[PDB]
Amino acid sequence: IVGGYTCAANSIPYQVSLNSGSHFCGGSLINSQWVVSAAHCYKSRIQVRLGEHNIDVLEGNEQFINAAKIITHPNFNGNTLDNDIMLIKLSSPATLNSRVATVSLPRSCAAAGTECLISGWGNTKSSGSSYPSLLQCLKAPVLSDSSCKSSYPGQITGNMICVGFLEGGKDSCQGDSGGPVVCNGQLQGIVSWGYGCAQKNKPGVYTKVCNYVNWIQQTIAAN
Ligand SMILES: [Ca+2]
Ligand code: NA
Structure with missing residues (x-):
């Protein structure tokens, strides 16, 4: 930004960081089990990091939850970025608190x-x-x-x-x-x-x- x-x-509290060894994209928590992000952020393995502020320090609100399913929009165009959206199902539900919310x-x-x-x-x-x-x-x-x-x-x-x-x-x-x-x-x-x-x-x-x-x-x- x-x-x-x-x-x-x-x-x-809905902001997530998508991590593959380091932060590479953002996403949004929309359900205890689901994050929405951009299809151009797709990778076959993603760790979702919720409750972050400092992505370089464990401050004690973080939940790190691997993606179980990663679904790009079927009409995502990798060139024009039309339909630039994907859904990530978390391998376990995020606990919702003041620091992690939909x-x-x-x-x-x-x-x-x-x-x-x-x-x-x-x-x-x-x-x-x-x-x-x-x-x-x-x-x-x-x-x-x-x-x-x-x-x-x-x-x-x-x-x-x-x-x-x-x-x-x-x-x-x-x-x-x-x-x-x-x-x-x-x-x-x-x-x-x-x-x-x-x-x-x-x-x-x-x-x-x-x-x-x-x-x-x-x-x-x-x-
Ligand atoms: Ca942190
Ligand atoms: Na921009």
Whole structure:
């Protein structure tokens, strides 16, 4: 996250870190047994790390739970990143407490200008790279579909939304992918792509989660 701030410890209790020897993507706890993330974060083995703030220190709220099932959206396009969503079933249920909690799937798609919270352990520098120990946060609004399409002519599908700032300076970046965009207590976005990060008129692009409530409930019921 570039241009953000360090989250209060455990104040984003649905944020997970996906770990394969080190942190490589974010995700969101949506059920005691299920995490949603980006299909481009797919690996055949993933350890889900819940209750993190410092991913480099055991602070005593962590639960490390291996993935038992990893299911990418059947229409995920690895090139365009259309349908950039996957579900991870945990090998045992996460215990839900104040530090580890689910986030609601959306009632409706978010209106333009809805304030959201984006989080992750991705790069914090727009010039060079620095990877944080501590979970970073960013307040950012949903952008209109017109603004999103003007930033990326011909590249925005119906499954994509832009969230952030056209002026630059404030965006998700490398290592945030798969993580949450939460607006009024509902998961509206998954960190997906952008043209670099925090550049002028290149806002972050996010998987439009409100398109996938049917697919998620189906997948949970089937597995
Ligand atoms: Ca930790
Ligand atoms: Na981004």
